[PDB]
């Protein structure tokens, strides 16, 4: 199963992925793409042959970085190679607002009627990540 | 007889790849990111007849955006709007497909109607291997190939 992971902090996301296995390019076959500004434009070069996406956003990040994350998720949502696929949206172990993410990301109106799941996840909460991945795999089975 | 033409066309389609029917990069009408959508550029764009134009930055093999001709119906040519405004506003998706991809799979990717133009890239290879841009392919090209096979009717 070929999956793609795109998110802010590309090496940070690849570290979160390495935590599961006990960057800036091609890395359950999860390919983690880099999060640098230049590589975000070239992200779309790798999307082919994917069956699901794992989108990571830094909710604790600054407002502009959150704006970039919202724009990137919106671009991924309407991509023809990714629009028909189910993909899960996941941040840090401990954070100083899923409802805020839904309201500000406008995922209630646009992200409606398709097998998409926005679930909380933390680096110190392994079981929650396992449950989120189990739901994602259950969606992949459809 | 007619079944012979049917089988020949089916064989031609099954053997044919996207690399065969694509337009190579040397023939592709493109435009740089630094361009400005002034009166002269719009004439050059509207005369080529292409409805979707790849927009690159730096090199013709570095494609960063797509330009839609329908987006140029409301623009005025005197304001000299830069291309960056339209590209950053619309931000159309970029389709990338490999050269080895077959007619059926690439054709399936268009079925959703969310896109009509893809960029053919090759797995090139010393030095670290990379993606190499070969050309562009459209839904029109595959449909022209299918009708050119005269299978239907």
Numbering used by the authors:
A (entry chain B): 33 to 54, 63 to 67, 78 to 140, 142 to 147, 151 to 196
B (entry chain A): 429 to 553, 556 to 583
What's in the article?
ARL15 is a member of the RAS superfamily of small GTPases and associated with several metabolic traits including disorders of lipid metabolism.
We present the crystal structure of the complex of ARL15 with the CNNM2 CBS-pair domain. The large asymmetric unit contains four ARL15 and four CNNM2 CBS-pair domains. As is typical, the CBS-pair domains are present as dimers with a small twist, possibly due to the absence of Mg2+-ATP. This twist generates two contact surfaces between the ARL15 and CNNM2 CBS-pair domains. The larger surface contains numerous polar contacts and involves two ARL15 structural elements: a C-terminal part of helix α2 with following loop and the loop following helix α3. ARL15 Gln98 makes intermolecular hydrogen bonds with CNNM2 Thr529 and the backbone amide of Phe526. Another key hydrophobic binding determinant is provided by ARL15 Pro130 that inserts into a small pocket formed by side chains of CNNM2 Pro521 and His523. Although a GTP analog was present in the solution, the binding site was unoccupied, suggesting that nucleotide binding was incompatible with protein-protein contacts in the crystal.
